[PDB]
Ligand binder design. Structure first.
Ligand SMILES: O=c1[nH]c(=O)c2nc(O)[nH]c2[nH]1
Ligand SMILES: O=c1[nH]c(=O)c2nc(O)[nH]c2[nH]1
Ligand SMILES: O=c1[nH]c(=O)c2nc(O)[nH]c2[nH]1
Ligand SMILES: O=c1[nH]c(=O)c2nc(O)[nH]c2[nH]1
Ligand SMILES: [Cl-]
Ligand SMILES: [Cl-]
Ligand SMILES: [Cl-]
Ligand SMILES: [Cl-]
Ligand code: NA
Ligand code: NA
Ligand code: NA
Ligand code: NA
Lengths: 295, 295, 295, 295
């Protein structure tokens, strides 16, 4: 037998960094959870018990802290590219570094209508992520995403005209609840190295904001024919506004809210146009995925 | 042996209700998770296999939906009191009803600076809860609360002057991070029945808003001497502004963020005044509780 | 306003201890998660910012490790009583200690039919817990429990003869699935102090084993008339076999498994006696509780 | 823009099936959680709001229940292949079906040393999974796995001889705790269709048992030089015993247990050979992966 693939590192490394403006007294915090997996000429640590080729995962943890100390941690696309580049430049036998970053939300509090200088609030479990693959000789591939963005619209969603056969019981509808937890990923054009990543730094935060705004506005305003149709419109817009993006992938749960027939109780009307009370369903759930690129 | 206590019912009943303003076209959604436990003369269902005294938990589920259909579900203090009163009035052998309600956040989206009529966003995992105990002959006891309100301040927190003995290693500090997930409960004066609860309906939403505002403002502005000292100030204010409240209870985790000594690496300075990068600790965590009443 | 109640300490303190038999070479591991909350004359840490009365929670953490080093950690009833006694004896102003212990399962592996000397397997998420309240002048109150014991029987469960009115839709049944996650707690006679707790040490492990065996055997063999009726039989037996127990409390979810009517599809029969495929329900769920004592 | 990839279906479909032996009266239960995602000529549901090409996810749910009713659900490799084949044979425009199955453990209870005919116990959160990709014209690809198998050995694990530079603080050790949650996947030779899958049915359960036994025995007996070295030995054996397997992939967290230096307290010795009490670390954790194939 042979080692066909191998990667190892440190997962779930929690990092907090604070910036302090000496002038204004205004402090800004950043919190993230970092994973780094390395590949390279490390097969003999598996086959021969040869640990000389292993950069200990504890050392990898240390390197994450040190790197955060000496460099900006925002935007995460940049920090990840610095962190990954470090490993392939520092260690001659390590030819790829895979860096995953989950950014947690610490939003500045408004107290008495005024932004507070050093107090924050986790105003949502929504994340902002990046996956950075730094491969020696092949540049830097970056996938940005937002996840855990949970929304619901109480009307202006439809689902009719679908295939009906002997396995079908679902009734067509022209008015239903649509709720989902949005997972959106935009993959960037391959970058040649750190210098090129640095040259596009302003585009990362701007593109994250545009992806979020487009997702929210399109969800809210589209008279949805289906989750499929709605998510395609989102992806189409994001591509049109950032040429450095090659693809956009959406993954959307369809979190069902069932009508409750209460007519058995005193002829109470609670279906169709009379539907007020619904039963949210934990499971099962639809799962719709699409990857959209350029023609 | 004998039955000393017994209660049974339905837990985790998810409910969604929509209100539709025919005029403005503006829709408002409410989602909650409801638990109802009943007590009474039901001992023989345990001792004699006598199910004639059991109001099936499935029926209890049905009753929650029907009640939500026919009554307002906001404020939750009112809905809970209606739901609990129903069981003790309807069934002669059922002398107490315990109703727990967890309200989930569906916040109206702002699209292009304008409130959207029927789209929403789960803008936080923060909850608003109520525990309503309706006891026949003894009225209605209500405990309101907010939970999952997670905050962090990066400075203006201290902890020094504590007891030092041979079990102590903790260094005194005059500048640290303070982060917690707030759990606050305010217990109302016992109400005589539904009519009295109805008479104070406007006070429930107002008091929830005041408890939240006081918690946030006091956290942000207090130069904290300790979690103990800070939470007492919160409780003191809430009591002063709502006379119908008898007690206020806070339960606050102290979620630690440790300094990282990086001096072993090229004399890098990252402690004390030079501290920029911290390691958030998942566990363990301090746990501070206090119940404050009137003298 | 005034401080009506106050307690503070350390939660989620993970502890691992290994015992090594020098003779046999056989090692035994113990893992637990510990919480300690203290009460006493500590009101001025809340009201006056007086930290001199605070035994830092970090020190409490240290004390847990030290105590585990110097004492047996099994049975948990004993370890908890030692840990709690320590705080009220050591600190003159601390009059109560509340100690919660969650024991995790590390079961010795069988390799080739032979017990392995130092390898283990988490053979279930079932726990064994204790809550120990050590109050100065009032002795030691201990509540032992097992939790997360999840079972299912595919027949020999019934539910008929329950109350039917206009809120009832549930059909009577003489054959259904019964599944639950068992939570059982047995409260011991108050002990006068550590010496008395030590004198009954052998009874703690024996009584835990009996409570588990009785729960499992009664669940498996009882032709259940209801969850109520079945759980009472369990409690009755446990009381009969350990006179040092004052009460036994069960809390049992009724985790529903619904029949699926597939007759709409080619007259497929899947209900009643023909029921083979069921839909497990995540929520809602029945919740049945009972506390049984001695007459 | 264009649709580069698309798949949609139903996730988290919980299924329970019971088998009843009319002769012995012995009942056997199976529970699983199923996901089915379809691909094909369905791009116009995204681009043109054309739902005529959509086999509703609700219908997919129905089809899972019906299929379970009419076919064996064990081994899961077979059930998944039947379920996936159905979709590509039934619908002319659907060219691939992806079926994920998570099997939950319901282990027959032993009551009084005797197997009980219809009572079971969730004796672990360990799973048995399968991922089945049925592609029209390209056969059936099956990946079997076990996950959530959590183990710990208290000695006979080492880690020394690793790379040391200016980012290294980790001390070499010749005796440490090793604990992990095992994730093991074995990928089968591509099958031509259902008939070939049926012909190898006995090999699926046998190979799962061998993978589990090899994992446990090798973990327990190997004087581990590293997680890398140990997991390679496991993979090597599994390949040697089942020729129909092409690759074996392990993914192993290294769940750290830190020594606690208690010497600051009365010279208490708790490190090295004197180490008895450890602090389990929730995070961070090492993550080691390897894919092993045939040379
Ligand atoms: O938007 C939807 N897309 C679907 O594919 C689908 N299938 C359903 O059963 N409902 C659905 N709603
Ligand atoms: O605010 C605090 N209260 C405490 O009781 C405490 N104990 C610590 O170790 N730190 C602490 N911080
Ligand atoms: O064992 C049961 N006890 C109950 O109270 C109950 N209520 C149901 O609807 N089903 C039930 N099953
Ligand atoms: O088995 C191990 N493999 C590793 O790569 C490693 N790195 C550490 O720091 N410890 C480790 N233990
Ligand atoms: Cl769907
Ligand atoms: Cl604390
Ligand atoms: Cl029930
Ligand atoms: Cl590691
Ligand atoms: Na390299
Ligand atoms: Na009554
Ligand atoms: Na004392
Ligand atoms: Na086809």
């Amino acid at each position: 037998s042979a080692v066909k693939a191998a990667r190892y590192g440190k997962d779930n490394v929690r990092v907090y960094k604070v910036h302090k403006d000496e002038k204004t007294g205004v402090q800004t915090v950043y919190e993230m959870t970092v994973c780094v997996l390395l590949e390279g000429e490390i097969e003999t640590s598996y086959t021969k018990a040869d640990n000389s080729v292993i950069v200990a995962t504890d050392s990898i943890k240390n390197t994450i802290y040190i790197t955060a100390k000496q460099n900006p941690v925002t935007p995460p696309e940049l920090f990840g590219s610095i962190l990954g580049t470090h490993f392939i430049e520092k260690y001659n036998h390590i030819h790829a570094a895979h860096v995953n970053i989950v950014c947690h939300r610490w939003t500045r509090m408004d107290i008495d209508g005024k932004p507070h200088p050093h107090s924050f609030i986790r105003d949502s479990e929504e994340k902002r992520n990046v996956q950075v693959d730094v491969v020696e000789g092949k540049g830097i591939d970056i996938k940005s995403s937002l996840s855990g963005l949970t929304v619901l619209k109480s009307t202006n969603s439809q689902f009719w005209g679908f295939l009906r056969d002997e396995y079908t019981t679902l009734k067509e509808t022209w008015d239903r609840i649509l709720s989902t937890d949005v997972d959106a990923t935009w993959q960037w054009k391959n970058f040649s190295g750190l210098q090129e990543v640095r040259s596009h730094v302003p585009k990362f935060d701007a593109t994250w904001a545009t992806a979020r705004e487009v997702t929210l506005k399109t969800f809210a305003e589209d008279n949805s024919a289906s989750v499929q149709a709605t998510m395609y419109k989102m992806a189409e817009q994001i591509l049109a506004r950032q040429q450095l993006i090659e693809t956009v992938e959406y993954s959307l749960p369809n979190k069902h809210y069932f009508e409750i027939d209460l007519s058995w109780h005193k002829g109470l009307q609670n279906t169709g146009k009379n539907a007020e009370v619904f039963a949210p369903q934990s499971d099962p759930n639809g799962l719709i995925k699409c990857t959209v690129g350029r023609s």
